[PDB]
Design a protein around this ligand. Sequence first.
Ligand SMILES: CC(=O)SCCNC(=O)CCNC(=O)[C@H](O)C(C)(C)COP(=O)(O)OP(=O)(O)OC[C@H]1O[C@@H](n2cnc3c(N)ncnc32)[C@H](O)[C@@H]1OP(=O)(O)O
Length: 194
Amino acid sequence: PTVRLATRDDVPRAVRTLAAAFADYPATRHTVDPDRHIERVTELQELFLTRVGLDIGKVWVADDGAAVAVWTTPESVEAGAVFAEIGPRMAELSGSRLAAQQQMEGLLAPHRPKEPAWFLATVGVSPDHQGKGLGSAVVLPGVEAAERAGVPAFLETSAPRNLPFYERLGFTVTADVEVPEGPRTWCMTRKPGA
Ligand SMILES: CC(=O)SCCNC(=O)CCNC(=O)[C@H](O)C(C)(C)COP(=O)(O)OP(=O)(O)OC[C@H]1O[C@@H](n2cnc3c(N)ncnc32)[C@H](O)[C@@H]1OP(=O)(O)O
């Protein structure tokens, strides 16, 4: 279980891991077109991993990409300009589920920290390596970094099996959001010193 920051050479295994990990995720199933679903989800994960994670955020990997963690920090300053580049393509990839994605964003936006914070954008572990402690190991550096910076760490999850996993890392449910014809979503925050 060797954890370190990611390089461009790691992207291929990382994207395979994220695509496989999010294959049956409730939020992805609600917000991404079912037509060529895995292909669409794979491009979204690649687009976020490279253009957001590696370019302006922070990305960690365990066992050369068997697990991945992507964060946006208070240091992620051209998030906005990056969003004008990749934004329209992400809407195309959402396809028929763009209205559902936009509805869900409106429900979660009020519960997001308006103050500077580290956001866990996405985390995935290869299905065959799940339950072996890799997820905890990849997310821990970002959690320690947020605490060192004196800012909260924040995330959103639509899978209730993840609540214990994040609770062990010091996170607490700050919002329990009901999505119409969609998945129940929990917003979680970890203030420095949890
Ligand atoms: C997008 C966001 O910010 S959150 C969405 C994160 N990713 C996903 O939900 C997609 C699929 N899930 C995964 O890739 C992984 O299972 C992770 C990253 C959530 C957890 O990583 P793991 O290596 O499995 O975790 P680790 O071994 O460190 O800890 C195990 C705990 O993870 C939780 N867990 C997460 N996903 C699962 C799952 N599919 N089935 C069972 N338990 C799971 C459980 O609470 C488990 O402990 P438990 O059996 O005692 O309840």
